[PDB]
């Protein structure tokens, strides 16, 4: 007499990750820990439906290292949308998705944008360079304190220098790399040196992108043009 059932879900522990739209892989380092829980619901078939009188939790198991992002890449996930830069990327275990404890597919949060887009409007232009200059001036006159200065005039930041969107803008805006600690995509705004070389580099990239000889490169291989600019 009816009935016995199991399924399984995942508790996932992860951090956000910043990416350029040109990048070909997401970083699984975003996944700090994942554990597959397995429940055993039992009871009886009901009138149209199911009733659960018991549930037996089998020993859960760490699968942090078995998790992948399947075929998703920043380049194939990026979609230009006004005031929207976040994506929930599904994880895959044994080549299939997993439900979380709320019955939704397990995902990790990423943010994806255009290098040089300080103001998060999906266009790299002179206004990104002048924003970056404003930040240069403000941090040149406060003891290099990033916590009282909002870099991006984006409404997603809204004047909050601690917003995740300001860290992201800083990641996008730090186009000229600086001597010192070798930074990863996981750096905080405060760790980056964003200064008049970044501002000038963004202005030069924009100006070059506007002229005929560079249009093909700007559209198709913008990293090559950034490299020309920053040398």
């Amino acid at each position: 007499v009816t009935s016995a059932v199991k399924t399984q879900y995942v508790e996932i522990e992860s951090v956000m990750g910043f990416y350029f739209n040109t990048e070909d892989k997401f970083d699984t380092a975003q996944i700090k820990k994942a554990v597959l829980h397995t429940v055993y619901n039992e009871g009886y078939t009901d009138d149209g439906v199911a009733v659960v009188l018991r549930e037996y939790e089998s020993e859960p198991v760490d699968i942090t290292a078995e998790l992948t992002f399947g075929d998703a890449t920043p380049a194939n996930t990026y979609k230009a949308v006004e005031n929207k830069f976040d994506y929930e990327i599904p994880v895959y275990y044994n080549n299939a998705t997993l439900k979380d404890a709320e019955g939704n597919d397990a995902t990790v949060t990423v943010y994806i944008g255009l290098k040089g887009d300080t103001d998060l409007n999906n266009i790299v232009d002179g206004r990104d360079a002048t924003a970056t200059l404003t930040y240069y001036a403000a941090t040149s006159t406060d003891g290099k304190d990033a916590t009282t200065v909002a870099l991006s005039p984006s409404t997603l930041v809204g004047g909050n220098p601690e917003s995740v969107y300001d860290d992201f803008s800083a990641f996008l805006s730090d186009v000229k790399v600086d001597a010192g600690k070798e930074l990863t995509r996981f750096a905080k705004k405060a760790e980056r040196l964003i200064d008049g070389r970044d501002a000038s580099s963004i202005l030069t990239f924009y100006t070059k992108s506007s002229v005929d000889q560079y249009k093909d490169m700007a559209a198709n291989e913008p990293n090559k043009l950034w490299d020309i600019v920053t040398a």
Binding site: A137, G143, D145, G196, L203
Partner: protein
Amino acid sequence: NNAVINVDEMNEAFKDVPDLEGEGAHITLSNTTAKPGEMAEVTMSVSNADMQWNMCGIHIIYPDILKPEMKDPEERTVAFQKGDALEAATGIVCMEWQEGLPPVLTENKKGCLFLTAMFSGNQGGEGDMATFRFKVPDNAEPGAVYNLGYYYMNTDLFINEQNIPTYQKYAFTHMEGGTITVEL
């Protein structure tokens, strides 16, 4: 001639840059006068650089009893009259250093403001860059002289599109300070 308060720190910054002399930028501050209580005009100017630079970022210093006229106190922006040397800039920003000043500036009772200008190509000009106004204390004594100079920060600039380090070394090592003298 030295008006950079932390000149030896600057010297270290430019230690490996060739020191070519000859034709470079001559940055200067003005020598003006004002009555006690008045707003003194102070002008930074650059000669011998017309069409030869694309960015600057400069810290000017002054006794901290002098207060620069503000545009927006909350953004810390400083009011200034733009001169011919900054015409056709793409962006310019001028801000007052209020918090986190270096010990060399606090110890010597200095205030500081920073002007940055950015051009698209070497459009930087010559002559006056910016004129600021400073409040001279009501109780200031006739004959009092207020020295105007600079502070060197590692990220400061006076550079051309070609990014030729010697051009910047010359500019920073040949700067001239200025004064405000209180009259009756």
